[PDB]
Amino acid sequence: STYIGTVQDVNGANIRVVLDGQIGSFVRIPIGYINLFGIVSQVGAGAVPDKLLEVEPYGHRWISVQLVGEEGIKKEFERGVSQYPTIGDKVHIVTEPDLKKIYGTQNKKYISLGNIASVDSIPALVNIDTLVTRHSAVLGSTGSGKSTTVTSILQRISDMSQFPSARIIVFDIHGEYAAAFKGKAKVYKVTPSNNELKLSIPYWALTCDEFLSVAFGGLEGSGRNALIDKIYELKLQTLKRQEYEGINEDSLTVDTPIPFSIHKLWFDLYRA
Amino acid sequence: ALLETWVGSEESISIFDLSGMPSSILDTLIGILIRILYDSLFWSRNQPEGGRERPLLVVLEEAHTYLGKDSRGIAIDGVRKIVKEGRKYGIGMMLVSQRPSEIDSTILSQCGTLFALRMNNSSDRNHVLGAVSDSFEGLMGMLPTLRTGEAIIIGESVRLPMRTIISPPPFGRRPDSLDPDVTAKWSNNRVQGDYKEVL
Amino acid sequence: STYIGTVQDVNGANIRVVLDGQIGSFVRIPIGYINLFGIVSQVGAGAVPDKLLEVEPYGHRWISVQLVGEEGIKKEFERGVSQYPTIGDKVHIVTEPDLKKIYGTQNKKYISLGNIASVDSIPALVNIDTLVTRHSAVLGSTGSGKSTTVTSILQRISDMSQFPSARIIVFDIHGEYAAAFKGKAKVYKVTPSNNELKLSIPYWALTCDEFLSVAFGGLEGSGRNALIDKIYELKLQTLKRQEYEGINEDSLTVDTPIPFSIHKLWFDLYRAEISTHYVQGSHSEENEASLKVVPPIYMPHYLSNRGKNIRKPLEGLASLLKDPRYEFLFNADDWSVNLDGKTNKDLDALLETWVGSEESISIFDLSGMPSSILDTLIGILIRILYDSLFWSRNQPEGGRERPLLVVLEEAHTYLGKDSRGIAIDGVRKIVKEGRKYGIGMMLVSQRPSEIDSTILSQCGTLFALRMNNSSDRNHVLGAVSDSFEGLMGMLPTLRTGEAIIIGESVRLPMRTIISPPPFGRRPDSLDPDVTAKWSNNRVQGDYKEVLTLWRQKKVRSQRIVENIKRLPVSNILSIGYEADSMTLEIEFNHGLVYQYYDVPETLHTELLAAESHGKFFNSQIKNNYRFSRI
Amino acid sequence: SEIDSTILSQCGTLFALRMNNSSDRNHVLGAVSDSFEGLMGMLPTLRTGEAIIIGESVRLPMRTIISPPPFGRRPDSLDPDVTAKWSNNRVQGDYKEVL
Amino acid sequence: EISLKVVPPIKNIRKPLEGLASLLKDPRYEFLFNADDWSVNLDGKTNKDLD
Ligand SMILES: Nc1ncnc2c1ncn2[C@@H]1O[C@H](COP(=O)(O)OP(=O)(O)OP(O)(O)=S)[C@@H](O)[C@H]1O
Ligand SMILES: Nc1ncnc2c1ncn2[C@@H]1O[C@H](COP(=O)(O)OP(=O)(O)OP(O)(O)=S)[C@@H](O)[C@H]1O
Ligand SMILES: [Mg+2]
Ligand SMILES: [Mg+2]
């Protein structure tokens, strides 16, 4: 069989089992008909109770374990605890079928993005409905391999067998992803290439503030009150000289993505 | 047609390469693209093209420079609105950065799930521990000693936190930046110089 | 008789027991004639005394004696004990009848919500006056009960057979509670639905300071004093034209709720800022050379001498009146104010509708609110409710004779320790001066640490769902009136739904399993489903429309059909059709109604004769036509 | 626990009643030199009305049961009653005056 | 710097002055500015003495 030890303490959730057990490995605790799964926290002198070493200063065989969830009556793994364990109970190791049970899921919203540390055959199912709706963030050191873990995920999301209608945008500042997606993406950049289109961001698709923030460096006096007057005038004429549905002489604002000629702005404003 | 290329192409993923940008304005553009992608999806949440029928996902590299705790840029304003109202219109987001402690703490906490790769300096680890909710005491004292690509995922996107090992992309599909190779570019015999053209 | 162990040694407080038992479970100790019920969180390995460990260190069966309350003289259970245990006495497990008496009561004051963990048959009796007069809070992790719990309490308190005059209000930023209350609640949202009203907050019912905090960003100059001067004349002028009872020119104030036309404000203020002056130095309007926002053209220009440095807010304000996203505040539908400042109705209907509806609950879903000014409006709504019941506390409709219960969802973003918003400046008052007017409060937040401590100190009782992180457990435990060590140690492992109630609204802190509401009556949020939306095949998009709407700031395509009739039948409820324009309208559960276009009506007949709906609708309609959902 | 300890010490005699939370039971102990286990070990199980007196104004400290005052002379705040005012049948109101 | 007064209508501590005026008009503070017997007239005499 597989035996670790016995529970020699209880505090509701925090438990301190004594052996006769890896730092991250789970622990299984049957109680009659349902089992409690737990997480190790520390090892050695960190798990010893406050008042034991006085008589046995060098008795170090203690481990601290924590409780995460509980398995129902052949139904599923439900978080929490139906009935907490007590002193002098049994303990068992988490074996291969159990890992499937705890981590398994029959729902179809989950997708496999990796393998757990202990057993390599376990898919690392992570919800995608949640990963795209709540939010996500990748953090780490510099050489820890972020962009490689942002492609091994961002490449499994847009698969063409399950998600033929996916949709994604990327912002790479060093240009290190275009090499990964050879025939799966539409790479954009400033310098054209043979099969890469050239990023183009029309200057008239911008609000008044943002255009004033990239072009004129930020004006605050009457200059800011003169440029706005001109842009409005230009977007007035383009409406008279060409037809755009819906936009009228009143619904038109300074910040509607309507085309205006920047060169005419500088030339006419500067020439005057 | 412009939008059709960014979002409506026949290939799913778009990739915007900004390494050529004049970096004095690199921040404002990140706040320009997010605004256009957000308004276009937000204002057409009925039609079959909006974010309610094809949910979006914006991934941002090196987010610690534009999401500073006291940054005065325009990107942080955009990254806050999508962090706040995106759940209604299905516009998620992914954040990448190697300096967590420089990220604003009011934006880093509103991210449901976190990938926790290696972290050594204690000004970050003590700051990541300040935003993750289901924080175990056995799997979060393990941050600085992970392997490369041995991420830890904690949040509600998983039933419970897991210490996964992401599968690397197939060889030849990896991300590779193209920087000049000094050892291979300095070691060759000197060639006759023609500096007339350089002027 | 369940014998386990007996006492054999004494160490002052540690009373040592040799054995021959759940953690948060009571123990019974009879002493002659009076029974002692209480908690002993120290037993076994965690209780063996340090003095004796030298003898037997490898054994753990030892208990201690410290109680909570004593059984009276066959009367009832009260906290405290007349006498403390002694030598020789033995501890017995509690029995179901004892649970009935300890948690039972003969008072009709209490109400039942959930059940005790041990035996489900027991009811979970919770006071109501203290649950509405002493305020309270709800706390726990993100995935625990949380909202599924708040609805059950409001769905039990607001029963008509037992409380036929209840009165409460709910703030739900995600708008996830309107689903549970199918037709028993009012629900106001910015963009209406088939049978829902408009959450219109008339701007003329705001204090001047709050008005300048939503429309001008906090002007802090001489111009700020120009607006106050300008608004006063409008508010003063409307009084002289229309008589109002009890206020005249003398006792008029800048902050009293008299309607005024903002359109006149911006137009007169904006026009008197820039215009040609026929005669130099003349500020008269006769020297210059309205239902719609259209301004008349002005000739080129000297400039008016009556102006200031408020050009940016004044032009920025004009924009706030254009976009439809703020239509609720500035274009209150039935409270829209014409140019002369005379609207159709007054706040009577607003108050009569918010709190005076024939049905008990009212709901304000704020998902449609722009998150920039979400905090500012939260404070505004609180002020209106408190003040209205303040100066009318003797009347027969106020809060004294019909107390209120304002519920706030997701509060941790609004009561921050360093938060400088107006919400906390409004929430503090009710927690302080709301006791003697009967204005309650229920706080919800998934992360208590950020909540201001003084606010969390003054709440009467606390609901404690599961809480994972250690940083927050320590903060919430620091504002507990009556805490148990055996009960609060299992806070990070509570299963979903069941909560722990602590405070003055119950006799004892108890671990209750709140009854889940009926299936189909739950708080559900209808957010887009990626897995069901990304998996379907591609569809050639027509972006020429997406651009057009994005330009027009509209949300409905110009090809919609409005006057179609429907006939009742995954769970398809109603199906429409129209051969004139080849439009097929369908309706599903949760009120979702689409409009598929250019579909042959042969399928319409086939579906009616298909008698196989659900499994057959996806056969030839799921992704085969262009639909403009509504 | 929140009160300033600077002003607490100068007080001569202190009456202490039922104290449940462990956080505050420690602070009160710090303002009394007579650290007696029996006096304060029984603090968290004191019945309503009970008290323990410590200070110079009392010759010897011990627990006493204060006799409650007679009915008709008893503190009670006249806060509105929720269940009594919600239980009564709903009555049509007129907000023309409340406004 | 410039009805109950006979005159017909025509330092940076102004906003205190308006805030000061709020207390005067409010009936809820009349216990302090408008004491039942202790209000001070322009002549300066009070109907009673603090003794
Ligand atoms: N998922 C992975 N699995 C195995 N090795 C990886 C993985 N990701 C990155 N690496 C390894 O790291 C090297 C790839 O280049 P790196 O610079 O180390 O990664 P990187 O993602 O480009 O770094 P950053 O700063 O996080 S973008 C190789 O030695 C990889 O084997
Ligand atoms: N008593 C219960 N028994 C079984 N399942 C429950 C119970 N209560 C809640 N749940 C389930 O757990 C889910 C958790 O979702 P919610 O109850 O809405 O919690 P929540 O996400 O914190 O609420 P907010 O206010 O939107 S953060 C629920 O949708 C249920 O499926
Ligand atoms: Mg990198
Ligand atoms: Mg909820």
HEC readout, chain A: CCCCEEEEEECCCCEEEEECCCCCCEEEEEECCEEEEEEEEEEHHHCCCCCCCCCCCCCCCEEEEEEEEEECCCCCEEECCCCCCCCCCCCEECCHHHHHHHHCCCCCCEEEEEEECCCCCCEEEEEHHHHHHCCEEEECCCCCCHHHHHHHHHHHHCCCCCCCCCCEEEEECCCCCCCCCCCCEEEEECCCCCCCEECCCCCCCCCHHHHHHHCCCCCCCHHHHHHHHHHHHHHHHHHHHCCCCCCCCCCCCCCCCCCCCHHHHHHHHHHC
Residues 1-51 of E with CB under 8 A from C: 3-4, 14-15, 22, 25
Q: Which of C142, C557, C628 minimises the CB distance to B133? A: C142
Strand partners, C30: C35
Inter-chain residue contact C447 with B135, CB threshold 8 Å: no
| Neighbour count for residue B131 (Cβ, 10 Å) | 22
User: How far, in Å, CA of C225 to CA of E15, rounded?
Assistant: 9
| Residue in C closest to B131 by C-alpha | C469
Inter-chain residue contact E25 with C249, CB threshold 8 Å: no
SS3 state at C101:
helix
Give me ligand 2 centre to Cα B132, in Å.
20
SS3 state at E51:
coil
Q: Chains D vs C: touching, with 3+ CB pairs under 8 Å?
A: yes
> Which chain E residues are closer than 8 Å to C253 by Cβ?
22, 25
Contact B136, A41 (CB under 8 A): yes
Q: Which sign, positive or negative, has the C-alpha torsion C570, C575, C580, C583?
A: negative
Provide long-range contacts, Cβ within 8 A and 24+ apart, for C225-231. Answer: C225/E14, C225/E15, C226/C308, C226/C310, C227/C310, C228/C254, C230/C265, C230/C269, C231/C260, C231/C265
| Neighbour count for residue D3 (Cβ, 10 Å) | 10
Amino acid at C262: I
Q: Among candidates B19, C40, C375, B156, which has minimal Cα distance to A188?
A: B19
B77 touching C, CB under 8 A? no
User: How far, in Å, CA of A246 to CA of A136, rounded?
Assistant: 39
Strand partners, D65: D50
H or E, element range at C461: strand C461-464
User: How far, in Å, CA of A17 to CA of A36, rounded?
Assistant: 13
> Which chain D residues are closer than 8 Å to C202 by Cβ?
none
Contact A7, A88 (CB under 8 A): yes
Burial of E13-23, coded b for 16+ CB within 10 Å and e otherwise, reads eeeeeeeeeee
* Residues with Cβ within 8 Å of residue C392, at least 6 apart in sequence: C398, D97, D98
Q: Which two tokens stand for residue C399?
A: 């809060």
Give the rounded distance of the alpha carbon of A26 from its chain centre: 24
Contact C71, C36 (CB under 8 A): yes
How far is residue C129 from each of residues C157, D70, E17, measured CA to CA in Å?
11, 25, 43
Q: Which two tokens stand for residue C137?
A: 């809070």
Amino acid at A171: F
Inter-chain residue contact C630 with B4, CB threshold 8 Å: no
Q: How far is B87 from chain A (nearest CA, A)?
A: 5
Would the CB of A144 count as within 6 Å of ligand 1? yes
Q: Strand pairing of C185-189 and C361-365?
A: parallel
Strand partners, C6: C18, C90
Q: Which of A12, A132, A245 minimises the CB distance to C530? A: A132
Q: Which two tokens stand for residue B22?
A: 């004049």
How far is residue A247 from each of residues A227, A240, A244, A253, B38, measured CA to CA in Å?
22, 11, 6, 9, 21
Atom from ligand 1 closest to the CA of residue A141: 26
Provide long-range contacts, Cβ within 8 A and 24+ apart, for C237-242. Answer: C237/C341, C238/C340, C238/C341, C238/C342, C241/C340, C241/C341, C241/C342, C242/C342
B96 touching A, CB under 8 A? yes
At residue C35, φ and ψ (nearest 5 deg) are -95, 145
Contact B101, B127 (CB under 8 A): yes
> Which chain C residues are closer than 8 Å to D27 by Cβ?
none
CA-derived radius of gyration, chain C: 32
Strand partners, C583: C578
Would the CB of A60 count as within 6 Å of ligand 1? no
User: How far, in Å, CA of C145 to CA of A6, rounded?
Assistant: 33
DSSP state of C516: P
| Neighbour count for residue D79 (Cβ, 10 Å) | 15
Q: Among candidates C242, C243, C259, which has minimal Cα distance to C206?
A: C259
Give me ligand 2 centre to Cα C476, in Å.
21
Q: Among candidates C622, C569, C574, C577, which has minimal Cα distance to C604?
A: C577
User: How far, in Å, CA of C364 to CA of C173, rounded?
Assistant: 8
User: How far, in Å, CA of A212 to CA of A225, rounded?
Assistant: 11
* Residues with Cβ within 8 Å of residue C71, at least 6 apart in sequence: C34, C35, C36, C37, C77, C101
C449 touching B, CB under 8 A? no
H or E, element range at C38: strand C34-38
* Residues with Cβ within 8 Å of residue B189, at least 6 apart in sequence: none
Give the experimental resolution in Å: 3.4
Q: Which two tokens stand for residue D24?
A: 């505050």
Supply angle C-alpha B44, B50, B55, rounded to 5. Answer: 145
User: How far, in Å, CA of A29 to CA of A36, rounded?
Assistant: 5
User: How far, in Å, CA of C24 to CA of D79, rounded?
Assistant: 35
Contact C422, C114 (CB under 8 A): no
Would the CB of C142 count as within 6 Å of ligand 2? yes
Q: Strand pairing of A77-79 and A92-93?
A: unpaired
User: How far, in Å, CA of A59 to CA of A48, rounded?
Assistant: 9
Q: Chains D vs B: touching, with 3+ CB pairs under 8 Å?
A: no
C246 touching D, CB under 8 A? no
Q: How long, in residues, is chain B?
A: 199
H or E, element range at C532: helix C530-534
Would the CB of C365 count as within 6 Å of ligand 2? no
| Residue in C closest to B156 by C-alpha | C143
Beta strand spans in C145-288 (E): 169-172, 185-189, 197-198
A242 touching C, CB under 8 A? no
> Which chain D residues are closer than 8 Å to C128 by Cβ?
82-83
Q: Among candidates C136, C174, C30, which has minimal Cα distance to C499?
A: C136
Inter-chain residue contact C480 with D21, CB threshold 8 Å: yes
User: How far, in Å, CA of C232 to CA of C234, rounded?
Assistant: 5
Q: Which two tokens stand for residue A218?
A: 């930020």
> Which chain C residues are closer than 8 Å to A163 by Cβ?
534-535
Q: Strand pairing of C5-11 and C14-19?
A: antiparallel
Contact B61, B96 (CB under 8 A): yes
User: How far, in Å, CA of C463 to CA of C511, rounded?
Assistant: 10
Q: Among candidates C460, C390, C452, which has minimal Cα distance to C421?
A: C452
Contact A88, A44 (CB under 8 A): no
Q: Which of A37, A50, A64, A165 to mutate to test the interface with C (most CBs of C within 10 A)?
A: A165
Give me ligand 1 centre to Cα A138, in Å.
14
Torsion angle (degrees, nearest 10) of CA B127, B132, B135, B139: -70
Supply angle C-alpha C592, C598, C600, rounded to 5. Answer: 100
Q: Among candidates A225, A261, A232, which has minimal Cα distance to A247?
A: A232
C367 touching B, CB under 8 A? yes
Would the CB of C176 count as within 6 Å of ligand 2? yes
DSSP state of C12: T
Q: Which two tokens stand for residue B163?
A: 């210490």
SS3 content of chain D, % helix, strand, coil (to 5): 30, 10, 60
Amino acid at B1: A
User: How far, in Å, CA of C231 to CA of C212, rounded?
Assistant: 11
- Name the residue with tokens 């500067």: A270
Q: Which two tokens stand for residue A258?
A: 């309507």
Burial of A34-58, coded b for 16+ CB within 10 Å and e otherwise, reads bbbbbbbbbbeeebbbeebeeeeee
Give me ligand 1 centre to Cα B112, in Å.
25
C538 touching A, CB under 8 A? yes
Contact C273, C285 (CB under 8 A): no
User: How far, in Å, CA of C426 to CA of C432, rounded?
Assistant: 10
* Residues with Cβ within 8 Å of residue D52, at least 6 apart in sequence: D15, D16, D17, D39, D40, D43, D46, D61, D62, D63, D64
Q: Among candidates B160, C332, C517, which has minimal Cα distance to A125?
A: B160
Contact D61, D52 (CB under 8 A): yes
Inter-chain residue contact A174 with B61, CB threshold 8 Å: yes
Q: Among candidates C378, C386, C385, C408, which has minimal Cα distance to C171?
A: C408
- Name the residue with tokens 């802090």: C220
* Residues with Cβ within 8 Å of residue C291, at least 6 apart in sequence: C339
At residue C204, φ and ψ (nearest 5 deg) are -70, -10
B172: burial class by Cβ within 10 Å (0-12, 13-18, 19+)?
exposed
Q: Among candidates C144, C184, C118, which has minimal Cα distance to C510?
A: C118
Q: Among candidates A190, A115, A181, which has minimal Cα distance to A154?
A: A181
Contact C11, C43 (CB under 8 A): no
Inter-chain residue contact B8 with C627, CB threshold 8 Å: no
Give me ligand 1 centre to Cα A119, in Å.
22
H or E, element range at C513: strand C510-514
DSSP state of D53: E
* Helices of type H across chain D: 5-8, 22-30, 37-41, 82-87, 95-98
User: How far, in Å, CA of C469 to CA of C473, rounded?
Assistant: 7
Inter-chain residue contact C397 with D80, CB threshold 8 Å: no
User: How far, in Å, CA of C509 to CA of C486, rounded?
Assistant: 11
Contact C167, C355 (CB under 8 A): yes
Breaks (C-N over 2.5 A) in chain E follow: 2, 10
User: How far, in Å, CA of A126 to CA of A83, rounded?
Assistant: 29
**Helix (H) and strand (E) counts for chain D?**
5, 3
Strand partners, B60: A171, B95
| Neighbour count for residue C441 (Cβ, 10 Å) | 24
Give the rounded distance of the alpha carbon of B96 from its chain centre: 3
At residue A131, φ and ψ (nearest 5 deg) are -60, -25
The DSSP line for C325-376 is: GGHHHHS-STT---TTS--S--HHHHHHHHT-SSSSEEEEE-TTS-GGGHHH
How far is residue D30 from each of residues C241, C605, D8, D27, D36, measured CA to CA in Å?
69, 86, 10, 5, 12
Q: Chains A vs B: touching, with 3+ CB pairs under 8 Å?
A: yes
User: How far, in Å, CA of A75 to CA of C230, rounded?
Assistant: 69
